[PDB]
Design an enzyme around this catalytic site. Structure first.
Site, short mmCIF file in Angstrom:
data_model
loop_
_atom_site.label_atom_id
_atom_site.label_comp_id
_atom_site.label_asym_id
_atom_site.label_seq_id
_atom_site.Cartn_x
_atom_site.Cartn_y
_atom_site.Cartn_z
N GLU A 66 48.17 12.43 52.22
CA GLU A 66 48.47 11.15 53.41
C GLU A 66 49.30 10.78 53.19
O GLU A 66 49.91 10.35 52.32
CB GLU A 66 47.32 10.61 53.81
CG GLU A 66 46.95 8.97 55.11
CD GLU A 66 47.55 10.08 56.12
OE1 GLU A 66 48.13 11.25 56.17
OE2 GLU A 66 46.04 11.16 57.18
N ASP A 94 43.46 14.76 52.83
CA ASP A 94 43.87 13.14 52.89
C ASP A 94 44.46 13.95 51.13
O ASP A 94 45.44 12.68 51.20
CB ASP A 94 43.03 11.78 52.98
CG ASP A 94 42.87 11.60 54.04
OD1 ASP A 94 44.05 11.71 55.21
OD2 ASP A 94 42.16 11.27 54.51
N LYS A 120 33.26 14.22 60.97
CA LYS A 120 33.86 14.65 60.34
C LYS A 120 33.50 15.85 59.41
O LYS A 120 34.74 17.09 59.66
CB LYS A 120 34.89 13.91 59.10
CG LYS A 120 35.32 13.11 60.07
CD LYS A 120 36.13 12.64 58.48
CE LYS A 120 38.10 12.18 58.94
NZ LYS A 120 38.42 12.78 59.65
#
Ligand SMILES: C[C@H](C[C@@H](C[C@H](C[C@@H](C[C@@H](CCN1CCCC1=O)N1CCCC1=O)N1CCCC1=O)N1CCCC1=O)N1CCCC1=O)N1CCCC1=O
Ligand SMILES: C[C@H](C[C@@H](C[C@H](C[C@@H](C[C@@H](CCN1CCCC1=O)N1CCCC1=O)N1CCCC1=O)N1CCCC1=O)N1CCCC1=O)N1CCCC1=O
Ligand SMILES: C[C@H](C[C@@H](C[C@H](C[C@@H](C[C@@H](CCN1CCCC1=O)N1CCCC1=O)N1CCCC1=O)N1CCCC1=O)N1CCCC1=O)N1CCCC1=O
Ligand SMILES: C[C@H](C[C@@H](C[C@H](C[C@@H](C[C@@H](CCN1CCCC1=O)N1CCCC1=O)N1CCCC1=O)N1CCCC1=O)N1CCCC1=O)N1CCCC1=O
Ligand SMILES: C[C@H](C[C@@H](C[C@H](C[C@@H](C[C@@H](CCN1CCCC1=O)N1CCCC1=O)N1CCCC1=O)N1CCCC1=O)N1CCCC1=O)N1CCCC1=O
Ligand SMILES: C[C@H](C[C@@H](C[C@H](C[C@@H](C[C@@H](CCN1CCCC1=O)N1CCCC1=O)N1CCCC1=O)N1CCCC1=O)N1CCCC1=O)N1CCCC1=O
Ligand SMILES: O=C1c2c(O)c(=O)ccn2N([C@@H]2c3ccccc3SCc3c2ccc(F)c3F)[C@@H]2COCCN12
Ligand SMILES: O=C1c2c(O)c(=O)ccn2N([C@@H]2c3ccccc3SCc3c2ccc(F)c3F)[C@@H]2COCCN12
Ligand SMILES: O=C1c2c(O)c(=O)ccn2N([C@@H]2c3ccccc3SCc3c2ccc(F)c3F)[C@@H]2COCCN12
Ligand SMILES: O=C1c2c(O)c(=O)ccn2N([C@@H]2c3ccccc3SCc3c2ccc(F)c3F)[C@@H]2COCCN12
Ligand SMILES: O=C1c2c(O)c(=O)ccn2N([C@@H]2c3ccccc3SCc3c2ccc(F)c3F)[C@@H]2COCCN12
Ligand SMILES: O=C1c2c(O)c(=O)ccn2N([C@@H]2c3ccccc3SCc3c2ccc(F)c3F)[C@@H]2COCCN12
Ligand SMILES: O=C1c2c(O)c(=O)ccn2N([C@@H]2c3ccccc3SCc3c2ccc(F)c3F)[C@@H]2COCCN12
Ligand SMILES: O=C1c2c(O)c(=O)ccn2N([C@@H]2c3ccccc3SCc3c2ccc(F)c3F)[C@@H]2COCCN12
Ligand SMILES: [Mn+2]
Ligand SMILES: [Mn+2]
Ligand SMILES: [Mn+2]
Ligand SMILES: [Mn+2]
Ligand SMILES: [Mn+2]
Ligand SMILES: [Mn+2]
Ligand SMILES: [Mn+2]
Ligand SMILES: [Mn+2]
Ligand SMILES: [Mn+2]
Ligand SMILES: [Mn+2]
Ligand SMILES: [Mn+2]
Ligand SMILES: [Mn+2]
Ligand SMILES: [Mn+2]
Ligand SMILES: [Mn+2]
Ligand SMILES: [Mn+2]
Ligand SMILES: [Mn+2]
Lengths: 181, 181, 181, 181, 181, 181, 181, 181
Positions: A66, A94, A120
């Site tokens: 990220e 991430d 998710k």
């Protein structure tokens, strides 16, 4: 001009590097921070949590995916996959954990952590990607009850999240932020 | 003027300190970075790997010999030899390991790690010098199957190497780099 | 004007903070770095060794007494004595070890470590003050065969000392420095 | 104008960040550092001890509450309480310990540590808040004989406190400071 | 230890570079700033005035001789003399004026400017050296009524001098400073 | 190793940026600063004079050609020629004057300025290139008696040159430097 | 907590040094920037205008009185008065003009410049203090039609003021700010 | 991924601040620097010329409109218009001249300056906006033969432009850049 109170709060709440990276991320996807101000606040928050998270391990433990442009994030993922043998995920994660050898998807939600993790978990097909949800009320939920970091590193995040909640509230911005997810 | 695409890529791929040290190294041996652009890319890569490698141990563990002028590199080697009793190597090594008490020769190859280690092993007579090869596909090979650093520190290097490979490829520079070793 | 080759070497050999602190120390005792150039080189060397030494422990382990003005060095010693109960030494030490609870006198000699330790041991009456001698040939000698730091931290010092010896030699300054102690 | 010798000593004794934070704290409560110069010296001292204290643990161990404006200190306390379940204290504490999961009230006294701890213990109702007293003579007293940090980290504080005492004394400011508590 | 109120005032009144240069100057002449505290205040003041003065002209106008070690100040004087043909002064001046082609001796006095200029004029034999006296009450006196700089640049100095006078007064240090010249 | 007293003096005489640029220049032409130490001192001196010289005009007045790699120096010359119409010189000049519209060749000599200007004047065919010689004794000689800069800017250079001469002399390096041109 | 939109705008509108100085000024007079948010915006604006104004003259032209603590502002005024002979004003001015030899009171108003100048002119008794009013619509009014600075320096201020007006407007903060004077 | 040689050249040709501002500008208009690489090079060039141009006047002379986000550029234009009375232009200009009281549109073209000025002159309706064209061959063309800046400031720009042309050429990027306008 939009002239948002939320925009000004975000620039005083987060450090300039976080603000700038989120601004750039939002534009890469064709979103304007001056209009989608809740998303502006969310991406800044998510970024800080990711950076706090990566600071929690031993040195060299995490690769931060990220906070990079789309093309470069997928480049680092490919190098990670092509050097560790892990399967390439379908959606950008991430972080990568060099200790546990798995990608991490980090989530920050204003709802119950259990319902965001469900979303998710179903969105991502790569069951190997480890999921870690944080809430603005201090709850967290992680795949296999494996929370990766030790307690103190996670408690910092939870404290910071609740501080952003309060800062938003004292400005009458929380209600709009909460009922926007 | 040469005006190389590789030269411009190297200056955008590596940090200025790495670029500058490699430039100086190449000149000390009478090579021009503007012409021998593959060698420019290789020495920058090798340097970054050495610096990443030395960052992998405990504090004070490694003495960095690479990245110095010839005369000073041999000076530090002599002080190391004259204070630890280790035999003086015939060819400049890359690091010294104060924990394992041995010099390290680090190699980065675009071929199979096994064939590059063979070459370096035969070139160096000092059988005491520990050899560690990294490849651009994520393989590594170390003397006595002793890899000095823990897994995560080595995985970072492998990831970085594969990222340089991709960056080169997306610019159609990889094929020329690969078939240059 | 004196215009010493040694003075210029010292300013290129040591970092400015070390040079400045030694200059100030020498003046506090009425010595001129531009004339007593061997002493200039010695005090810079001793200071670097002390700083390297204090960097060898865990964080907060050592109190650095060397590198302060006379009055302030004795102030920190008094606070250390008045808070740990250790007896106040008669002569300024170089460090204090919060782990082992004892002052450290550090010595750097161009002679055999055994003869320099004898001198310092007899000079200091406080038998509690721990003594650690380093030589320019890589030998060391410590009270009770207790060397305080682990091997790698001490090996760095020995390597650095031998590097200063060589740098001096290549300039034909070593012989004058050696036969000056 | 007041023109205090103590004010000038405080600005030369403490680092600018500490001075500035104490100045701001004193003003928030309607006290002038140029008049209440003993309080100026005390708050700077207390702040340094808190910062030294928080530097003593593992990374991420402590949340620093002292050194913030009133409103923000209580905000961080609320986030800590609302995320760890600890009861909200009635009076602002100095730190939070993520390892031991308790707030810490730090005290610095010119009297016997035992009499200052009594006062703070009775003032605070939250028996959960851990108390740690330091004295200017090197004594300390902590709740349940639990001193949180290891010996060396506490010894640094004690040494620093006695150094401030001496610095005050050599300027004939100690007597006025001592007989002001 | 001396523990002077004046010493602490000087370190809070002047910027660190000025303090450090004056400290070094005083030591070069065998004076201790911790004892000769009036001289400490005077040399810092004189230095600031010289630096303010040299900032008053066009770029490149002045060579600053003050604020250097004795040997180097005389070196720059010699180069100035050996390149402009001006006679070498018998006593170190404070500046050199490349526009008017003359050295400048700057004076700061707590007495009437006329009596201090008399002293300096008789002390220096080189009648060519231009003299400029400033007082702590805002008077100035210059050779041949030639004040070198324009009014505003000189007024800044006079204002700064009177501010130091007040700062000293509000601390009851002025009387001792005044009756010390 | 060479271990030159001149090399150490050069690194203490000149600022690091000047030293580094001269080192790089010397290597580009296949000269070693550690051996050709007089040339090391000369190129550093010449560079400082060029930089001092370019600082003498109004802002934007000069283009600095010296202090660049060969290829880039000729690039800037070409852009200057191709945009001002001036003829392209046969030999690299040192500056370009946007006010007077001419290149400047700067010379620093240990001989009589008149004999060095003769040499440079005959070497360069481009009679348009303005020549400015400085000597280590404070003389200067410029084409057409046109000295480009005002007196004070040139006097600074002359003073600096004589200071380098003295610094060399006090170290017994001047005689070797002088009888090397 | 107040949580003002104006407070957040002020911290994003003005540079941190301006914000901090205004915050400190407001507290010195017992005003809270978190409540008196219009005054927070006004004092920041006034400060920037003063700093812009002082940047408009030749170097050394202006003494900045605004942006200092009360006691120090009056100290600099006294030194100015005691060195220039100007009468001491009854109310703190904003600048001193070493060229025109007069204090300047600067005003920024949301009303017609003519009515604000009337107020300040009657408030101040010292008719010598020069008055300069700026408005948020680009008008200005100065004593004796003497505007001190040249046109461009004043136009910058007027442009900046109108930009703050717009920034306020786009956030719906202007109306409250305007109807607050 | 695109992997452009031009993209890498632009990042090595221009300073990071220029690159970043152009990148942001291109994205604001929905252009990708990684694809529209000629436009990437053009906007960086245009920006540098604007910054060089604004550096050419007296301090405070120019307001830089280029290099801002669309909304803020129009805000500064409005403040300029609403404070100087100049008519508001229909298209964003590049600068504002506080001396000549007019906006400036700056153009950089690879064609004959006369044909580019024609285009811009017809595009803009505001005949008041001053036009200044620069070419990559060193020609320039300005409204009313009024070139705003003095010769040397404009010559710098022309030299820089021709240097970018060469840098492009030596890499075989010029032909594609030229035949892209
Ligand atoms: C120091 C940091 C530590 C860390 C941020 C961290 C990693 C960021 C920035 C590095 N970048 C930015 C783009 C190019 C690149 O390599 N990365 C790395 C991958 C991509 C990315 O975005 N690093 C390391 C170097 C500097 C830096 O910022 N943390 C953790 C807490 C919040 C935060 O920022 N700290 C410490 C506190 C303030 C701060 O910034
Ligand atoms: C970073 C340093 C680390 C260390 C030096 C060390 C301690 C010095 C300087 C601090 N001072 C100077 C006078 C006032 C004061 O508090 N102390 C402390 C007691 C008195 C003294 O002199 N610290 C810590 C802060 C900055 C600093 O220098 N080391 C160890 C290696 C050589 C060296 O310098 N490093 C790292 C490498 C370069 C460097 O300088
Ligand atoms: C910026 C300065 C301007 C000036 C100080 C000035 C000259 C000093 C320091 C330079 N030195 C120090 C020793 C080695 C050397 O070359 N010189 C020059 C000759 C010997 C000496 O001592 N310069 C120029 C470079 C940095 C510096 O300090 N001024 C004028 C006002 C007070 C002051 O300091 N400014 C501006 C304000 C704060 C500051 O410091
Ligand atoms: C500030 C300088 C002023 C000046 C040096 C000057 C020009 C140099 C360095 C810029 N560079 C280095 C390589 C890439 C590039 O663009 N140039 C320009 C053309 C090529 C070259 O080499 N500039 C300007 C920017 C920084 C810099 O150094 N001067 C004049 C006196 C001695 C000196 O150095 N000053 C002031 C004193 C110390 C210092 O360094
Ligand atoms: C550079 C500045 C220029 C100027 C601010 C200016 C004066 C301030 C700060 C100096 N201080 C702060 C307290 C102690 C002291 O001496 N003064 C002087 C008197 C009291 C005061 O408050 N100076 C000079 C040194 C640094 C500084 O800030 N300007 C003009 C525009 C806005 C601004 O700030 N610039 C340039 C732009 C950004 C900036 O800050
Ligand atoms: C120093 C600069 C000088 C100048 C750039 C100039 C103006 C820029 C940046 C300021 N910004 C960036 C966004 C917010 C803001 O206020 N502006 C002003 C209006 C919008 C904009 O973009 N300023 C001034 C402050 C710092 C800065 O960059 N120049 C001229 C030459 C190239 C260049 O960059 N210099 C000198 C050389 C390198 C450099 O950068
Ligand atoms: O990485 C994420 C991402 C997450 O990792 C995440 O946890 C939640 C949400 N994400 N998305 C982030 C994002 C991140 C944080 C908070 C909200 C959003 S909402 C959509 C969006 C994102 C980034 C820019 C943008 F313009 C967006 F509209 C996108 C999903 O596409 C891959 C990158 N990404
Ligand atoms: O240290 C090395 C070195 C290595 O350590 C190595 O592993 C491979 C190769 N090396 N060589 C490096 C080098 C380093 C990295 C990648 C390619 C090259 S190719 C030759 C060369 C090198 C340095 C400068 C230069 F101009 C060269 F031609 C030389 C061998 O002589 C001692 C120093 N050195
Ligand atoms: O601390 C030391 C010190 C040592 O700790 C030491 O180990 C050897 C020698 N020392 N001395 C150092 C010193 C330090 C290092 C190398 C040589 C010298 S030689 C005398 C001298 C010293 C400092 C200034 C000075 F002008 C001197 F003449 C003095 C002894 O008085 C207390 C301080 N000190
Ligand atoms: O946090 C403290 C605080 C302590 O934590 C403490 O241990 C002793 C004393 N405190 N007080 C500090 C303080 C801190 C250190 C030394 C003396 C004082 S004396 C009163 C005072 C303080 C801060 C500003 C001020 F203007 C004051 F008058 C106040 C009590 O109200 C909460 C904040 N606080
Ligand atoms: O340059 C000066 C100097 C002056 O220029 C001056 O104007 C007055 C007085 N000076 N002296 C300065 C000095 C400077 C400013 C204020 C007081 C003093 S009092 C003696 C003294 C000075 C420096 C160090 C020191 F230890 C001293 F005792 C000495 C005279 O020897 C040459 C250098 N110098
Ligand atoms: O620019 C110069 C140059 C001058 O401008 C000059 O004035 C005198 C002498 N130069 N030369 C300089 C140089 C500069 C200053 C002092 C001595 C030397 S001696 C030869 C040499 C130079 C640079 C590097 C190197 F390795 C050399 F051997 C060379 C002549 O080739 C073009 C560049 N250049
Ligand atoms: O200097 C000023 C000042 C001016 O110079 C001014 O022009 C207008 C108004 N001022 N006042 C400023 C101020 C400055 C700018 C805008 C609004 C205010 S409103 C009152 C106030 C000020 C500062 C702090 C504070 F808490 C206040 F309530 C006070 C008047 O007492 C001397 C200092 N001062
Ligand atoms: O300011 C300009 C601008 C000029 O000032 C100019 O002179 C030429 C061209 N411009 N345009 C610049 C631009 C600037 C420099 C070189 C090429 C381009 S090509 C279009 C474009 C620009 C900026 C971003 C972007 F994505 C674009 F497609 C746009 C015209 O809309 C207002 C801003 N702007
Ligand atoms: Mn993500
Ligand atoms: Mn996520
Ligand atoms: Mn190597
Ligand atoms: Mn190698
Ligand atoms: Mn010692
Ligand atoms: Mn010692
Ligand atoms: Mn507290
Ligand atoms: Mn406390
Ligand atoms: Mn003097
Ligand atoms: Mn003087
Ligand atoms: Mn040249
Ligand atoms: Mn030359
Ligand atoms: Mn005011
Ligand atoms: Mn005002
Ligand atoms: Mn534009
Ligand atoms: Mn344009």
């Amino acid at each position: 001009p939009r002239g948002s109170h939320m925009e000004d709060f975000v620039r005083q709440c987060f450090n300039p590097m976080i603000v700038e990276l989120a601004e750039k991320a939002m534009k890469e996807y064709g979103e304007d921070p001056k209009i989608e101000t809740n998303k502006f606040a969310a991406t800044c928050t998510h970024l800080e949590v990711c950076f706090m998270y990566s600071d929690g391990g031993s040195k060299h433990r995490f690769e931060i995916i990220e906070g990079r442009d789309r093309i470069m994030a997928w480049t680092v993922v490919n190098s990670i996959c092509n050097t560790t043998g892990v399967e390439k995920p379908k959606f950008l994660p991430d972080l990568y954990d060099y200790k546990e050898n798995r990608f991490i998807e980090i989530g920050v939600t204003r709802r119950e952590v259990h319902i965001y993790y469900l979303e998710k978990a179903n969105k991502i097909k790569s069951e190997k990607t480890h999921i870690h949800i944080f809430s603005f009320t201090g709850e967290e939920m992680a795949t296999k009850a494996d929370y990766t970091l030790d307690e103190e590193s996670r408690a910092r995040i939870k404290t910071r999240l609740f501080t952003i909640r309060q800062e938003m509230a004292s400005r009458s911005l929380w209600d709009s932020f909460r009922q926007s997810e």
